[PDB]
Design a protein around this ligand. Sequence first.
Ligand SMILES: O=C1CC[C@@H](Oc2ccccc2)C(=O)N1
Ligand SMILES: [Zn+2]
Length: 109
Amino acid sequence: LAPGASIFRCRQCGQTISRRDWLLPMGGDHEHVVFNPAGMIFRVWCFSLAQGLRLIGAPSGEFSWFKGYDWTIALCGQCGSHLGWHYEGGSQPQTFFGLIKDRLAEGPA
Ligand SMILES: O=C1CC[C@@H](Oc2ccccc2)C(=O)N1
Ligand SMILES: [Zn+2]
């Protein structure tokens, strides 16, 4: 009854992005802490599915945090906030989203 932790929205604008139900335990955990080559740390949650994003450019394998996957930058389709990455080109699953947990807001359906 009345769950308050069902939907993830863009923290900056409220755009609908994903659901707790769609969390994906990649390598046995949904949470992955990673750094980019600029040394920025991200707490990434893996989702099987997401919506309301805009995927920018073509995939790159360069410095992929997930073995066998190529990444594309995922912006909030509404406000342009960088919310994470779409991963593709791999196996089991072929694709998923790695979203930056602190750039989302969790709340009711
Ligand atoms: O899996 C990923 C996705 C983002 C990616 O960041 C950059 C990669 C190359 C150059 C600049 C940033 C990364 O390090 N790993
Ligand atoms: Zn947004």
